[PDB]
Amino acid sequence: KAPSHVPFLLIGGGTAAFAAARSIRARDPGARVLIVSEDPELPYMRPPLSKELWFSDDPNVTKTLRFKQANGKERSIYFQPPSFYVSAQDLPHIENGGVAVLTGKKVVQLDVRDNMVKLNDGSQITYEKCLIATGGTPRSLSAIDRAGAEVKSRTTLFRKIGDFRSLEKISREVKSITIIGGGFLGSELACALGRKARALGTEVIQLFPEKGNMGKILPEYLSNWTMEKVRREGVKVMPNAIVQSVGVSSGKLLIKLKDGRKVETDHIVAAVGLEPNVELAKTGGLEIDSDFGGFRVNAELQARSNIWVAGDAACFYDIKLGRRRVEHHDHAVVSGRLAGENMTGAAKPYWHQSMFWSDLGPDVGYEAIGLVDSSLPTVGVFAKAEDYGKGVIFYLRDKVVVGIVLWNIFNRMPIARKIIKDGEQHEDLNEVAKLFNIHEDGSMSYCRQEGKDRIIFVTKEDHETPSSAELVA
Ligand SMILES: Cc1cc2nc3c(=O)[nH]c(=O)nc-3n(C[C@H](O)[C@H](O)[C@H](O)COP(=O)(O)OP(=O)(O)OC[C@H]3O[C@@H](n4cnc5c(N)ncnc54)[C@H](O)[C@@H]3O)c2cc1C
């Protein structure tokens, strides 16, 4: 039972909303914050759904939804125990405030002038400050939408706890699973499913239009190296694949590609991008970004007076890097926190950069920051003992580093932040790479230029010489 009025209203019960709620409470100890969540589940982190929860030793991981971190500490996907929240009944009156989550309730109408929303059940809530943190909904393929009810019921869109539970069940009861999508989600699920299938010898297929996995973010040579790694996890990878039609044939899904090839499979998992949830822009009169999608907000994540946007749904202005829309866990954290600080009057711009990460089997793990885009010219520095095992990849624009990928090297994000912040025009990025110490614990080094991409292979002796890189202090 929601209150008629609440000081802080958070639309969406995901990662960005929770971070904003924690941030608001940290700056305003008496704050009373209401999260309106369409989802019946309380706020939870999503990255475990495509990684750690598939690799748990526990047979009941599907019910406990607990996973063990790299440090060995078991954790819950939920951000907080249910007890840490207060009920919506008590939110207006409980001493020193708190955070309540109204679950199973969708905001369907937004009035920015009168600072009011309406829920799917007719309730109306007025607010003083409002955060839109609606995230996005998985996109679908046109060929899937034309295939009818049978195919659509055998096609999974992966995002929620429920999606993990249903796919985990299917993985134990079918013989072939086909993943459509080459990005981080399609690739992470392929490695997880591929690893589950090694025991029973079942089939796992991944197909996508690009030349290789992660083709939109990684340079072509590293995308190819990565594809071979995914293939080595027991996955049949089909690059250069454009789905022309899908149908059911003799109890089995049959995918037809423009190439002419054909795939027969028992279940499809479609990981082909995200659609920002901008339905409230119509009633609210809020602007949507035509180039990036999502609500257009400024550097402070503000859309209009008393209304902010954070997370996957927010197209914001980065003072250093330009207008962006970022769909990553740590961004939802950073943006939700920034929005909460600004809802309490901080008026701070996006400055501390968000990062992201992925793991594609045991041989591929990276962190990244900034404009990681494979269309940009790049300089990649890899350790020489072609093996792309450990290294750092710089993404350039106007001779300036605007994005960095840390390839199988960890705890280097501090250095990567400084490089992005300073914005220097470096004459030799091999000198900058020395700061990352990619050989921690005798032939000559060499380099190669493959179109827009430079590839430097550096030995320990050369890499651990003094660096002339310019750092701003
Ligand atoms: C399986 C998976 C694995 C991932 N792995 C990684 C990873 O390894 N690294 C990484 O950096 N990122 C990863 N991500 C991305 C990261 O999880 C997302 O960027 C993050 O969840 C975005 O949080 P959010 O708050 O912006 O949106 P969401 O988490 O989508 O939260 C939005 C919530 O609001 C609800 N909602 C929508 N509209 C309304 C409305 N009108 N009223 C009320 N509620 C509404 C939605 O139902 C949803 O519950 C992964 C995502 C998924 C799905």
Q: For ligand 1, atom 7, name the residue with the nearest CA.
A: 47
Q: Is the CB–ligand 1 distance for residue 46 below 6 Å?
A: yes
Give, in degrees to the nearest 5, the angle at Cα 295 between 9 and 279.
75
Q: 254 and 242 in one domain?
A: yes
Given 230, 251, 272, which residue is the final one in a domain?
272
The C-alpha atoms of residue 401 and residue 394 are separated, in whole angstroms, by 6
Q: Is the CB–ligand 1 distance for residue 233 below 6 Å?
A: no
How far, in Å, from the CA of 11 to the mean position of ligand 1?
A: 13
How far, in Å, from the CA of 263 to the mean position of ligand 1?
A: 31
Q: 112 and 36 in one domain?
A: yes
Q: Is residue 28 a part of any domain in this protein? A: yes
Q: Is the CB–ligand 1 distance for residue 14 below 6 Å?
A: yes
Q: Is residue 70 a part of any domain in this protein? A: no
The C-alpha atoms of residue 214 and residue 237 are separated, in whole angstroms, by 12
Q: 249 and 186 in one domain?
A: yes
Contact 180, 141 (CB under 8 A): yes
Which CA distances in Å does 200 have to 54, 61, 277? Answer: 15, 20, 39
How far, in Å, from the CA of 259 to the mean position of ligand 1?
A: 34
Tokens for 201, please give them: 């010898």
How far, in Å, from the CA of 15 to the mean position of ligand 1?
A: 6
Q: Is the CB–ligand 1 distance for residue 159 below 6 Å?
A: yes
Q: Is the CB–ligand 1 distance for residue 186 below 6 Å?
A: no
Q: Which long-range contacts (CB under 8 A, 24 or more apart) does 292-298 make?
A: 292/323, 292/324, 292/325, 293/325, 294/325, 295/132
How far, in Å, from the CA of 17 to the mean position of ligand 1?
A: 10
How far, in Å, from the CA of 255 to the mean position of ligand 1?
A: 29
Q: Is residue 266 a part of any domain in this protein? A: yes
How far, in Å, from the CA of 53 to the mean position of ligand 1?
A: 17
Secondary structure of residue 407 in the 3-state scheme: strand
The C-alpha atoms of residue 243 and residue 373 are separated, in whole angstroms, by 24
Residues with Cβ within 8 Å of 261's Cβ and at least 6 positions away in sequence, in order, are 238, 241
Residue 334 lies in domain: 5-43+86-137+275-343
Q: Is residue 335 a part of any domain in this protein? A: yes
Q: Is the CB–ligand 1 distance for residue 276 below 6 Å?
A: no
Nearest-10 Cα torsion for 257, 263, 266, 270: -40
The C-alpha atoms of residue 378 and residue 391 are separated, in whole angstroms, by 13
Q: 263 and 151 in one domain?
A: yes
Half-sphere exposure for 450 (CA within 13 Å, toward CB)? 11
Q: 129 and 146 in one domain?
A: no
Secondary structure of residue 16 in the 3-state scheme: helix
Residue with tokens 């454009």: 242
Judged on CB neighbours under 10 Å (0-12, 13-18, 19+), 465 is exposed
Secondary structure of residue 345 in the 3-state scheme: coil
Backbone angles phi, psi at 280, to 5 degrees: -75, -10
The C-alpha atoms of residue 163 and residue 120 are separated, in whole angstroms, by 24
Q: 287 and 259 in one domain?
A: no
CATH no. for residue 385?
Answer: 3.30.390.30
**Which atom of ligand 1 has the smallest separation from the CA of 18?**
25
CATH no. for residue 20?
Answer: 3.50.50.60
Backbone angles phi, psi at 370, to 5 degrees: 90, -155
Backbone angles phi, psi at 341, to 5 degrees: -60, -40
Task: Walk across the sheet containing 155-156 and list its strands.
Answer: 155-156, 267-270, 176-180, 203-207, 236-238
Q: 128 and 147 in one domain?
A: no
The C-alpha atoms of residue 388 and residue 13 are separated, in whole angstroms, by 40
Q: For ligand 1, atom 19, name the residue with the nearest CA.
A: 328
**Which atom of ligand 1 has the smallest separation from the CA of 15?**
25
Tally the domains of the chain: 3
Q: Is residue 64 a part of any domain in this protein? A: no
Give, in degrees to the nearest 5, the angle at Cα 84 between 306 and 342.
20
**Which atom of ligand 1 has the smallest separation from the CA of 314?**
26
The enclosing H or E element of 429 equals helix 429-433
Q: Where are the beta strands (DSSP E) in 69-200?
A: 74-76, 98-103, 107-111, 116-119, 124-132, 136-138, 155-156, 176-180
Experimental method: X-ray
Q: 104 and 23 in one domain?
A: yes
The C-alpha atoms of residue 43 and residue 458 are separated, in whole angstroms, by 45
Backbone interruptions in the chain following residues (C to N > 2.5 Å) = 385, 441
What are the helix (H) ranges across 303-376? Answer: 329-343
Q: At 216, which amino acid appears?
A: K
Q: What's the chain's length in residues? A: 473
Q: 20 and 117 in one domain?
A: yes
Residues with Cβ within 8 Å of 229's Cβ and at least 6 positions away in sequence, in order, are 360, 361, 363, 364
Tokens for 272, please give them: 């082909």
Q: Is residue 191 a part of any domain in this protein? A: yes
Q: Is the CB–ligand 1 distance for residue 133 below 6 Å?
A: yes
How far, in Å, from the CA of 451 to the mean position of ligand 1?
A: 36
Q: Tell me 223's DSSP state.
A: H
Report resolution in angstroms.
Answer: 2.3
Q: 396 and 429 in one domain?
A: yes
Neighbours of 417 (CB within 10 A): 16
Q: 285 and 237 in one domain?
A: no
Q: 451 and 382 in one domain?
A: yes
Task: Find the helix packing angle between 329-343 and 15-27, rounded to 10°.
Answer: 40
Q: Is residue 285 a part of any domain in this protein? A: yes
Judged on CB neighbours under 10 Å (0-12, 13-18, 19+), 283 is middle
What are the helix (H) ranges across 122-219? Answer: 142-146, 149-153, 161-171, 184-200
Which CA distances in Å does 305 have to 111, 126, 302, 352, 384? Answer: 12, 14, 8, 24, 55
Q: Is residue 196 a part of any domain in this protein? A: yes
Q: At 105, which amino acid appears?
A: K
How far, in Å, from the CA of 136 to the mean position of ligand 1?
A: 7
